[PDB]
Design a protein around this ligand. Sequence first.
Ligand SMILES: CNS(=O)(=O)c1cccc2cnccc12
Lengths: 350, 14
Amino acid sequence: GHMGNAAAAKKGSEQESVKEFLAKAKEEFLKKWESPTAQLDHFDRIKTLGTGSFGRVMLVKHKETGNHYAMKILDKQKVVKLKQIEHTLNEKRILQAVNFPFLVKLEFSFKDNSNLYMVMEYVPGGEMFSHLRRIGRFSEPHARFYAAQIVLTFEYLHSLDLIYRDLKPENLLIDQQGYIQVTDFGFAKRVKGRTWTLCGTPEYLAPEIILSKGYNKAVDWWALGVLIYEMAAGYPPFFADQPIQIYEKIVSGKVRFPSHFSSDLKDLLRNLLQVDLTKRFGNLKNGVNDIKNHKWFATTDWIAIYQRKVEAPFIPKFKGPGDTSNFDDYEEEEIRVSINEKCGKEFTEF
Amino acid sequence: AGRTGRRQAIHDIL
Ligand SMILES: CNS(=O)(=O)c1cccc2cnccc12
C-alpha cells in the first residue's frame, strides 16, 4: 500500500490521539457553554483597526493594567434592523466557550444603553488580507503553513458541532510568531446537522448556500478551498465585480487554475471545491483525514503546527504593544451612548 | 475583473 507498516501504525496512533484530544476539548467546551465583565470607562480608545456592518473594532488600552486590546463595538439598533440578534448572541456565547491556539481570545464583554462590546486580545501583525494584497500571492509552502492551521481549527470547531461560516483573509490575523488568529464569529453557530440562514461573504459561499439548501458544516471545507486558492493565486476562484455574477460562477462550479499551481494543489482544490456533497473532502466517511493525509500536506507535521513549533514563513515587524503600523487607517467616529436604553428586551442574554 | 478590496459579509440573498 501507500504506507509501510511503521508509517501506518504511527498515523493510526496519531489519529486516535486526535480523537482523545477532541473528546476532552468537548468536555471543556460544554462546561463553559453551560456555566460561563467590564465597562466602557475602563478603557482608553486609541484608533480604529477595522470596520464592518454592525460596527467597528478599536484598539483600546485598559486603564488599570495598561494592556492593549481590540474592542468590537456593535450598535444595538443596527443589529436589530439587520436581524442579527441571534447571530450576535451566538458570536459572544461561542467565543466565550472555545479555546484553541488559533482562535482569538475574548477577555471581556458588556453592553450599555446603545452598544454591545466584545474585548479581545490585540493581534498586532495585521490581517492576512493586507499582507496577501501587498505581496500578490503566497508560495505554496507559505500558503500551506496557514492552511494547516485552518484545517486544525475547523477539525476542533466541527467536533464541537460549531460551523464557522465566514472564512476569508480579512478575518485572519497574523500574530507575533507568524501564526494565524481567527476573528469574527459573527456567523458561527452550534449546528448538529442542517442549518438554513443565507449568510457569509459572496466569494466564499458554497453552492448549497446560494441554492437555499439546508446545508451543513461542509460549507466550511468549501470555503477552505476558496482560501487556499486565493492565498496561492492572489485572487479567489470565483471572481467578478458584483455578487450576482460571483454566485453564477460558484454554482457552475467550473474552476480554472493558474499554470503555476502544482498538480498536488489542483487535486486538493478540486476535492474541496466540489459541488457534489457526496464527494467533497471533509464530508466523507474518512472525515478530516482525507484532507490531512492528502499529498499536498505530506510535508505538514500536524502536531508541530498545533504546538506552534514550526518556524513561520513571515514574522510581522513588532514596534511596541500598542503599535498599529500593520493596519490601515479608517475614518474615526465618536462612540455615542444614548441616555435612553435601546433594545433592552432583545439583548437581555448578552 | 473582480473585487480587490475588503469584502463585507452578507446577511441575506434577495
Ligand atoms: C480583522 N481585523 S479587526 O476587525 O481589526 C479585529 C477583529 C477582531 C479582533 C482583532 C484583534 N486584533 C486586531 C484586530 C482585530
